[PDB]
Tab-separated table of C-alpha atoms in Angstrom:
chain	number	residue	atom	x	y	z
A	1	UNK	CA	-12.078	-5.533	9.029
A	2	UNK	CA	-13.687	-4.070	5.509
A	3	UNK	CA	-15.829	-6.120	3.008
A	4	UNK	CA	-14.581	-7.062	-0.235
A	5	UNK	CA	-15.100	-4.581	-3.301
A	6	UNK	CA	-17.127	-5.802	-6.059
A	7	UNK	CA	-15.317	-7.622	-9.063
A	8	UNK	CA	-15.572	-5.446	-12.632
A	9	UNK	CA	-12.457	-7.890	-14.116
A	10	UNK	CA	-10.742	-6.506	-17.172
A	11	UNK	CA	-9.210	-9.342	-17.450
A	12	UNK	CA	-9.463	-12.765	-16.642
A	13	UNK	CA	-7.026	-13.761	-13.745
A	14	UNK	CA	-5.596	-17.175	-13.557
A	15	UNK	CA	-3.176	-19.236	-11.813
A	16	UNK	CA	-0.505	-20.413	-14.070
A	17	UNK	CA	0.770	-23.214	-11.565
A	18	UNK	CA	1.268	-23.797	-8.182
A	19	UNK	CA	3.508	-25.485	-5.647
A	20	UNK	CA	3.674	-26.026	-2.097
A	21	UNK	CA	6.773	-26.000	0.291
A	22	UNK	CA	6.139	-27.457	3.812
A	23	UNK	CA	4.142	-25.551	5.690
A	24	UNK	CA	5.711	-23.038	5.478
A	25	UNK	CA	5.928	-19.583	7.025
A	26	UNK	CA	2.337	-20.359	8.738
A	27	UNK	CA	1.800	-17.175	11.822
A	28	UNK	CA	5.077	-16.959	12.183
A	29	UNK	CA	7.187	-13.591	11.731
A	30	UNK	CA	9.467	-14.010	8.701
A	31	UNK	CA	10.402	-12.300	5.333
A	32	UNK	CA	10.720	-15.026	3.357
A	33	UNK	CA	9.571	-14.447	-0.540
A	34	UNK	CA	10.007	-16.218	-3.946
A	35	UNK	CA	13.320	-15.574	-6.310
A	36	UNK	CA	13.895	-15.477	-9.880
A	37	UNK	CA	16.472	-15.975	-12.728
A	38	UNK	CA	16.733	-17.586	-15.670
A	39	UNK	CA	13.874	-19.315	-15.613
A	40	UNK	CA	14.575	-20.853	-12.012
A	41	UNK	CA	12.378	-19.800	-9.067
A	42	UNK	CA	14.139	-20.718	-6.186
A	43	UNK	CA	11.895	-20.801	-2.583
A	44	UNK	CA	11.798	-21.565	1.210
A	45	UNK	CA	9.886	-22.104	4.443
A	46	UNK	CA	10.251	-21.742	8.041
A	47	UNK	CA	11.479	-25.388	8.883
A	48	UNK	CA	14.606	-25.027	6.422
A	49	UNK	CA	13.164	-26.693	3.074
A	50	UNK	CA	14.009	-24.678	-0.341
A	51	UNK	CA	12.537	-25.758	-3.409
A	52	UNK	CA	14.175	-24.529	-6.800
A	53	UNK	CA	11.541	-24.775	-9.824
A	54	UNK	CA	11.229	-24.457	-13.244
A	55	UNK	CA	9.407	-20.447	-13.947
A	56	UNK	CA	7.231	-21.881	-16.744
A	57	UNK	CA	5.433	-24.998	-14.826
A	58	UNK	CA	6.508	-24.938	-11.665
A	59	UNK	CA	7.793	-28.627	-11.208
A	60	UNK	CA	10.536	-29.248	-8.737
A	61	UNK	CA	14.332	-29.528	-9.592
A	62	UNK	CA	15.998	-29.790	-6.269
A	63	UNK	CA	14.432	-29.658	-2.915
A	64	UNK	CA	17.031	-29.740	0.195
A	65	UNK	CA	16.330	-29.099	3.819
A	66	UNK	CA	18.135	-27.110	6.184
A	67	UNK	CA	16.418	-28.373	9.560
A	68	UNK	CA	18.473	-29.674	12.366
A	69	UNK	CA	18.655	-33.160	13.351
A	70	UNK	CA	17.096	-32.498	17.461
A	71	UNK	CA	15.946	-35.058	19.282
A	72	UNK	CA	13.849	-38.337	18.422
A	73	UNK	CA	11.770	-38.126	16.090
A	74	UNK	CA	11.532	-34.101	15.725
A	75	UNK	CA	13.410	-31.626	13.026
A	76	UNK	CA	14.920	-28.795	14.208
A	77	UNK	CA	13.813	-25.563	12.265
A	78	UNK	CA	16.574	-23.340	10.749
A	79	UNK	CA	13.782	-20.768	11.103
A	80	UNK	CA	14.253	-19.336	7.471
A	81	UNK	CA	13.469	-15.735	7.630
A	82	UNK	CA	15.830	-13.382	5.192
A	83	UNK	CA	13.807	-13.989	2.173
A	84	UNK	CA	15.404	-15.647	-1.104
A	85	UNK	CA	17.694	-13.622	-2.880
A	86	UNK	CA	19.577	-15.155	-5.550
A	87	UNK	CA	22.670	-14.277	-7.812
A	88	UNK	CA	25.924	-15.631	-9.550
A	89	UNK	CA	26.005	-19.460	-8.870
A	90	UNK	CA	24.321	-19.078	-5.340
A	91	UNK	CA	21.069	-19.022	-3.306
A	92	UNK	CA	21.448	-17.046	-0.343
A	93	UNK	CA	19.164	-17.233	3.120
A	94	UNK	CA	19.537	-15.649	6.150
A	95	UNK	CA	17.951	-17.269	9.512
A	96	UNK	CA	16.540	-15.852	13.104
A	97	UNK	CA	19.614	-18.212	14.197
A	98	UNK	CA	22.197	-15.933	13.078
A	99	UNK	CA	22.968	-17.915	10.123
A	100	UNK	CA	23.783	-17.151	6.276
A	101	UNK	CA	23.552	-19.703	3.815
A	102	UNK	CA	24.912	-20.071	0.293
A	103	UNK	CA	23.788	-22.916	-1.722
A	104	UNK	CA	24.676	-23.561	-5.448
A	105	UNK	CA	22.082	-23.170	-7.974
A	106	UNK	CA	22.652	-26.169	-10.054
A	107	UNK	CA	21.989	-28.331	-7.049
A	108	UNK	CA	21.201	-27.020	-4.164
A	109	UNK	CA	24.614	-28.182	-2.155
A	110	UNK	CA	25.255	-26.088	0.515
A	111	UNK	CA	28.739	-23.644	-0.968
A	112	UNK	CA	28.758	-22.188	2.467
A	113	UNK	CA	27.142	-21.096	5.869
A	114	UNK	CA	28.310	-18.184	7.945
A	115	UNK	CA	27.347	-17.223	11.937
A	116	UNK	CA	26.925	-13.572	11.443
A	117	UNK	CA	26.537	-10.738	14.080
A	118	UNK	CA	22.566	-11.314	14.770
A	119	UNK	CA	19.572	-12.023	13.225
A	120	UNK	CA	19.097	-11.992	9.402
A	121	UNK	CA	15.676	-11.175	9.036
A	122	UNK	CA	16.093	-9.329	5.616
A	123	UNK	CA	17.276	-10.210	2.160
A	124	UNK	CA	20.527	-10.362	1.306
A	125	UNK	CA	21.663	-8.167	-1.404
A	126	UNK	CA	24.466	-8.850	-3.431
A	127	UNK	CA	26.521	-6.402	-5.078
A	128	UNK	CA	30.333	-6.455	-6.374
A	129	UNK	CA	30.618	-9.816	-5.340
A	130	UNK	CA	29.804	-8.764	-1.330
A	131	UNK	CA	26.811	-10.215	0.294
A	132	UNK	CA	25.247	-7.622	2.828
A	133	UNK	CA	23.577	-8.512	5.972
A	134	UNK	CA	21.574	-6.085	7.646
A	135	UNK	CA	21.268	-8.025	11.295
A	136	UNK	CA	18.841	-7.160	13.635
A	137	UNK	CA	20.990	-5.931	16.473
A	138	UNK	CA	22.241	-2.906	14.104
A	139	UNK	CA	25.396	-4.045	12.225
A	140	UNK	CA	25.600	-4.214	8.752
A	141	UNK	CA	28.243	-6.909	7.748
A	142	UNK	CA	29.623	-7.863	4.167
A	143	UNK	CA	30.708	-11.672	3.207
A	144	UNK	CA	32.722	-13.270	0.032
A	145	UNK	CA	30.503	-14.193	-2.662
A	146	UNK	CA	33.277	-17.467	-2.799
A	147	UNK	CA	33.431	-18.819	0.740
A	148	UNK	CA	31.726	-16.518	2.662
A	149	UNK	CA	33.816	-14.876	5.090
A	150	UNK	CA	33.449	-11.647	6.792
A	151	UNK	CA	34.859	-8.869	5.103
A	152	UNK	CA	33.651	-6.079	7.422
A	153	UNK	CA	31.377	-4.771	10.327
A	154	UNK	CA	29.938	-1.478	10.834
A	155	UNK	CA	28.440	-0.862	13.867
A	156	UNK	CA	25.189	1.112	12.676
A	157	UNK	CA	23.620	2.941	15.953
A	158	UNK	CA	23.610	2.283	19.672
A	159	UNK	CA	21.392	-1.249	19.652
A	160	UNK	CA	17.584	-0.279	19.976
A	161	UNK	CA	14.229	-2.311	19.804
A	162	UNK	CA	14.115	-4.912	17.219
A	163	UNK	CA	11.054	-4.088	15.239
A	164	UNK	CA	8.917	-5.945	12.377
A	165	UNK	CA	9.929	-4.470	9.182
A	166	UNK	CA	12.348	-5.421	6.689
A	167	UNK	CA	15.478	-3.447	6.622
A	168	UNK	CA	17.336	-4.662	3.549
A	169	UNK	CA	20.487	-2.180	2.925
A	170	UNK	CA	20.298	-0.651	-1.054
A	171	UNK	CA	23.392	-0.011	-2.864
A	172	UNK	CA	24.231	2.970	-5.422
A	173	UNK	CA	27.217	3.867	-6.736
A	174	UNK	CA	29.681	2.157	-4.322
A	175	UNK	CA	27.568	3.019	-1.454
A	176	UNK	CA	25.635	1.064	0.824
A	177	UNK	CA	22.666	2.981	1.746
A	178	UNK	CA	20.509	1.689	5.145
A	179	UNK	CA	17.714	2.166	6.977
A	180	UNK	CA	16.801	0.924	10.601
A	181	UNK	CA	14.757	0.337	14.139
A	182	UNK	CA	16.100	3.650	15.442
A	183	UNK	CA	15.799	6.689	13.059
A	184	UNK	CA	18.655	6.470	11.426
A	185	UNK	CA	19.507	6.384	7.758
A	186	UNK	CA	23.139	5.274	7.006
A	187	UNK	CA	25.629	5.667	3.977
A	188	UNK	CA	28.394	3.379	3.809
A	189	UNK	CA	31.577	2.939	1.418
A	190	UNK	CA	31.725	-0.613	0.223
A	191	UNK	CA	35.296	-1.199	0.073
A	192	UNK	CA	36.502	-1.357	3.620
A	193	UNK	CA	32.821	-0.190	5.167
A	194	UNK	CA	33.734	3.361	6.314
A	195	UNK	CA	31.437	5.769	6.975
A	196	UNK	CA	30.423	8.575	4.578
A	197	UNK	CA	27.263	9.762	6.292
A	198	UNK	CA	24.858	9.326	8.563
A	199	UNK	CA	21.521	11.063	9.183
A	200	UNK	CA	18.832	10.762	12.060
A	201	UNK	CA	15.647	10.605	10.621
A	202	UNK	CA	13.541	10.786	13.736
A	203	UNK	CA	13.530	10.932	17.162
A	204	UNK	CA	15.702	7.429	18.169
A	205	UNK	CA	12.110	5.322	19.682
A	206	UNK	CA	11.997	6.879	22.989
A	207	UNK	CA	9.765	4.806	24.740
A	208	UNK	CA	7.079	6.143	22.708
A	209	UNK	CA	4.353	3.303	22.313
A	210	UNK	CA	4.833	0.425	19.632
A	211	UNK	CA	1.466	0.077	17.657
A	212	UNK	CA	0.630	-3.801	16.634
A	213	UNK	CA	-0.111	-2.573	13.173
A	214	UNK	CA	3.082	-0.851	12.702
A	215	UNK	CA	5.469	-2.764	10.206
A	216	UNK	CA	7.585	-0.473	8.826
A	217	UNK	CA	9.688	-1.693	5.841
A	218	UNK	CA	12.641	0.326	6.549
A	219	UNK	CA	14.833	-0.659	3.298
A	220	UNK	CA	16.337	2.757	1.578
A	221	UNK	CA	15.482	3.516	-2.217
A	222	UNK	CA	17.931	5.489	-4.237
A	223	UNK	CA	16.363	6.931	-7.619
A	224	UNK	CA	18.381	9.357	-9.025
A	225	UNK	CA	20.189	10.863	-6.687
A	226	UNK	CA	17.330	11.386	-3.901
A	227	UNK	CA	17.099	8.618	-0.937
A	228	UNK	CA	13.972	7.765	0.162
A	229	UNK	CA	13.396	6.483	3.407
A	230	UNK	CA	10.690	5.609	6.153
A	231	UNK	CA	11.781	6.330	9.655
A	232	UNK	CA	9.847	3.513	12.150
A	233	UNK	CA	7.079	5.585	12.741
A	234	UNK	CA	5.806	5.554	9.532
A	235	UNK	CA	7.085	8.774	7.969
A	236	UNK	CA	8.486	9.154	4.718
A	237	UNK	CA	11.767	11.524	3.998
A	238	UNK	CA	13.482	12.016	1.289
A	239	UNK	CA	17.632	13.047	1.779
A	240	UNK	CA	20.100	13.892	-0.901
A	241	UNK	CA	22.080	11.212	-1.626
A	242	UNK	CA	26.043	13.078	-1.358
A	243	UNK	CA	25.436	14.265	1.635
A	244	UNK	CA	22.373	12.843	3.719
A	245	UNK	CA	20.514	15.900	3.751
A	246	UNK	CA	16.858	15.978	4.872
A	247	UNK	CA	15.134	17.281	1.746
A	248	UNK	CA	11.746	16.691	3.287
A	249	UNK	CA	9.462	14.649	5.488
A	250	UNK	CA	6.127	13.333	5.620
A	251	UNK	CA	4.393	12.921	8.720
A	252	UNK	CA	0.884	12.003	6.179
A	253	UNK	CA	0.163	9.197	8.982
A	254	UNK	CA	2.509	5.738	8.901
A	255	UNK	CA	3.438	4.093	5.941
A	256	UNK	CA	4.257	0.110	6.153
A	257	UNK	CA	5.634	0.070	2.764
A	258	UNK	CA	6.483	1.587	-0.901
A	259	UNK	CA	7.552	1.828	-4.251
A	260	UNK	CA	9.118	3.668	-6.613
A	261	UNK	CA	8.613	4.162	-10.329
A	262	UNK	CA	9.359	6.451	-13.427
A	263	UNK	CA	7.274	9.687	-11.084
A	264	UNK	CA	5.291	8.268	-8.931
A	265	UNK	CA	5.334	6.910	-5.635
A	266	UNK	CA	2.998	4.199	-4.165
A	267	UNK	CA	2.842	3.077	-0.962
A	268	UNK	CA	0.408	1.076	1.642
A	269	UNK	CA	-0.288	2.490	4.974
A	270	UNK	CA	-0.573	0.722	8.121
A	271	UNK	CA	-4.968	0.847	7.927
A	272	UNK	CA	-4.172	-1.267	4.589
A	273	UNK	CA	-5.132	2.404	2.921
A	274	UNK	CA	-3.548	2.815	-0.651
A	275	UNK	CA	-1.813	5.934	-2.126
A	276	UNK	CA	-0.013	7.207	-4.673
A	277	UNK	CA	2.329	10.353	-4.166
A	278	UNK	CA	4.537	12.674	-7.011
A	279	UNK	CA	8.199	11.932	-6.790
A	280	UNK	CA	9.627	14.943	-6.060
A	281	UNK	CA	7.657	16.176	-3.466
A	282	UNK	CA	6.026	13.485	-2.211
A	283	UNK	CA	2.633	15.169	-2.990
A	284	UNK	CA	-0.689	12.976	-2.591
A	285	UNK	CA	-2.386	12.079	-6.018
A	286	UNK	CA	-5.111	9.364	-4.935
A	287	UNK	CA	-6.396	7.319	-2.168
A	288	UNK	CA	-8.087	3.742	-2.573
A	289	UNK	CA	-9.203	3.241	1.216
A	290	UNK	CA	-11.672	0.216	0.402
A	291	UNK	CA	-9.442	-1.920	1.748
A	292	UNK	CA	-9.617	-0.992	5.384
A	293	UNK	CA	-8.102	-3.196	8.021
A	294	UNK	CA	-8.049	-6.225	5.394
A	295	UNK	CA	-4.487	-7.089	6.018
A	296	UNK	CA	-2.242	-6.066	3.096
A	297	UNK	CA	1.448	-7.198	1.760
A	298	UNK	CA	3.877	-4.971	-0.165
A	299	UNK	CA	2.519	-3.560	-3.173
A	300	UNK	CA	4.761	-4.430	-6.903
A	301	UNK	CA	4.203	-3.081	-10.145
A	302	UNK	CA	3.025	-5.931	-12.987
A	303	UNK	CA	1.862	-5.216	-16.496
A	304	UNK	CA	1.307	-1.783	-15.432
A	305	UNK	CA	-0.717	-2.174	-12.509
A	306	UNK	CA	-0.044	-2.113	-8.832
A	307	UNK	CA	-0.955	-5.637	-7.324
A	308	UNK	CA	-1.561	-6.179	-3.524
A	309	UNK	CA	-2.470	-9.497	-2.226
A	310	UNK	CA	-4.485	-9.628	1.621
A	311	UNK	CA	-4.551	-12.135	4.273
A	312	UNK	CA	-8.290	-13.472	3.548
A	313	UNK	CA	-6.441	-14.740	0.081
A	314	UNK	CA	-7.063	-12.376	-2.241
A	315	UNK	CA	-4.841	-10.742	-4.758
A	316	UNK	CA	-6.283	-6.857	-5.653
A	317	UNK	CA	-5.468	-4.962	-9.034
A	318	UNK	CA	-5.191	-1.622	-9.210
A	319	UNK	CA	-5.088	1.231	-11.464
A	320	UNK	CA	-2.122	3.500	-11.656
A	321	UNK	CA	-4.077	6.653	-12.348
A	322	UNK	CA	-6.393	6.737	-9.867
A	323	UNK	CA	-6.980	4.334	-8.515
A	324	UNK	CA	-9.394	2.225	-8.857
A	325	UNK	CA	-9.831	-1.470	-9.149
A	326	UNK	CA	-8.952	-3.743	-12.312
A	327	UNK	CA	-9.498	-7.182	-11.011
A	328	UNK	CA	-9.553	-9.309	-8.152
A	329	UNK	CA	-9.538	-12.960	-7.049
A	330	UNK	CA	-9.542	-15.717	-4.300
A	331	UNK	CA	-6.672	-17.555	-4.744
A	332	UNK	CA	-5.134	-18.936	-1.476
A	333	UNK	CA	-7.136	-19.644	1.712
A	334	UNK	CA	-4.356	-19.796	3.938
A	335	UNK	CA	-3.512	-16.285	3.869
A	336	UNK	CA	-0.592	-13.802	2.188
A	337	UNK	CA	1.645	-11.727	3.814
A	338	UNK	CA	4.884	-11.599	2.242
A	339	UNK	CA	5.747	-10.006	-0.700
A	340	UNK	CA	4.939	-10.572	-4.243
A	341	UNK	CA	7.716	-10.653	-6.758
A	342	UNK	CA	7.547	-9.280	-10.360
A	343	UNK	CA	10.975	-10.061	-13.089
A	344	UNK	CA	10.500	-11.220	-16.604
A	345	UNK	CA	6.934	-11.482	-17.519
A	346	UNK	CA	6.140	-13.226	-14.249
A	347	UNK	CA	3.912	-12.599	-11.340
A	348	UNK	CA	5.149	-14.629	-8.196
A	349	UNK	CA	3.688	-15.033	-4.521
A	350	UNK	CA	3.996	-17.121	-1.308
A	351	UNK	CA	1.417	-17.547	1.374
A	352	UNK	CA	1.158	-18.482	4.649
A	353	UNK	CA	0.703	-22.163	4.189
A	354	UNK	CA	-0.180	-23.358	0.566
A	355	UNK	CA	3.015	-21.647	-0.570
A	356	UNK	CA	3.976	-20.728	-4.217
A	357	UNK	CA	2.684	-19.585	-7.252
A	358	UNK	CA	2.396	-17.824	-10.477
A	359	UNK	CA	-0.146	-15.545	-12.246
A	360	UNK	CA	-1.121	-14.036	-15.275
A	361	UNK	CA	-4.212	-14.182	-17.763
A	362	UNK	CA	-5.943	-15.221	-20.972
């Protein structure tokens, strides 16, 4: 592992409030993460239970439960994986049984609930009133904001290994833009799903060796007109965004995850190593490497500073310039691991067990 860095706060970290749900995403794989809007955070576990709260104090509105009714005395578990995403009247979910739901905001009331082509293991994303599913066997399928039926399939790449990593598909001007398990980054028209490019990225995994720390969060990001993409193994690339042309790659060492903001880039490598790159070129500004084999989620940008939480409980602040640490605290003993969420003035995270809650200062 790495020890913890000592704690120069700039400020005073609290916890706002906090609320549990179940029990919830425990050791489990999943991608399940906090949503906001308008002042509503809406929330899940494993077993099927989603919470919607009030953003300000964090007491419950509605809390329904999408668990199966199996056997005596047990619940069946929905097994709640494709981490909240909310917009227009709905809350939508996607399961590891192939399932989409749509529930309405006001109460929770299941709208809909769709069998789609295989696993949902990543966020919906809506976008001109089509929900897109990025399932795990390599289709990308769109559904009816109104009742939820299948608009279209594409049939991505010739099925591969189904690795961990998020793979949510990006939009941009009409486009879908995705990413995947087998080197391939994909370009789709969102009317009737047809094909304007595709581009291998790397070598399609051929039976090269699957590391346990490799957790590659394969989701496209389109800022101005450049894609950027990490291929499975880690590497980051960056294509034009007409055509799917490989601008350049870096094969730095393997990237989990990144961001993107005004020039920088800012990612997290698979050693829980910290960076920040240049936009255009992907260029390396700063390292923060105290933080070694701890066991880090996503980073986000809040208040100006990139926040990281670990699986011993902590959160970790950290300066944009280099580099350094702002702030730090235990919050959680049951660890993180999913992602925190940053919209309007709020800091939001979920853990392993003792579930939600929201941060800030004074």
């Amino acid at each position: 592992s790495s020890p913890l860095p000592t704690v120069e706060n700039q400020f005073t970290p609290t916890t706002a409030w906090s609320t549990s749900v179940g029990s919830g995403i425990g050791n489990f794989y999943s991608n399940l993460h906090p949503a906001l809007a308008d002042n509503v955070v809406y929330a899940a576990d494993r077993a099927g239970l989603v919470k919607a709260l009030n953003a300000d104090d964090g007491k419950e509105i509605w809390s329904v439960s999408l668990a199966e009714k199996d056997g005596w005395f047990s619940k069946e578990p929905a097994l709640l994986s494709g981490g909240v995403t909310v917009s227009g009247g709905h809350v939508y979910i996607g399961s590891e049984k192939a399932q989409v739901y749509a529930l309405n905001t006001s109460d929770g009331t299941v709208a809909w609930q769709t069998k789609v082509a295989g696993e949902a293991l990543s966020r919906p994303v809506v976008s001109d009133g089509l929900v897109l599913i990025h399932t795990s066997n390599g289709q990308l399928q769109a559904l009816n904001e109104a009742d939820g039926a299948v608009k279209w399939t594409v049939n991505l790449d010739m099925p591969s290994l189904s690795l961990r990593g998020e793979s949510a598909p990006t939009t941009a001007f009409g486009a879908a833009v995705v990413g995947g398990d087998n080197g391939r980054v994909s370009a789709v028209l969102m009317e009737q799903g047809q094909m304007i490019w595709q581009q291998r990225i790397s070598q399609a995994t051929g039976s090269t060796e699957i590391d346990r720390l490799s957790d590659v969060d394969t989701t496209p990001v389109v800022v101005n007109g450049v894609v950027f993409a990490l291929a499975y193994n880690g590497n980051l690339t960056a294509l034009d965004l007409r055509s799917g042309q490989i601008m350049w790659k870096r094969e730095l060492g393997s990237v989990n995850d990144f961001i993107v903001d005004g020039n920088r880039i800012y990612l997290v490598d698979q050693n829980d190593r910290v960076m920040a790159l240049t936009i255009d070129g992907g260029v390396t500004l700063w390292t923060q490497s105290d933080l070694l084999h701890r066991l880090l989620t996503s980073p986000v940008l809040y208040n100006g500073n990139l926040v990281v939480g670990d699986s011993e409980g902590y959160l970790h602040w950290i300066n944009v310039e280099d580099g350094r640490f702002v702030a730090q605290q235990k919050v959680d003993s049951s660890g993180f691991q999913t992602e925190p969420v940053a919209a309007d003035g709020k800091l939001l995270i979920q853990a392993k067990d003792g579930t939600v809650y929201s941060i800030t200062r004074a």
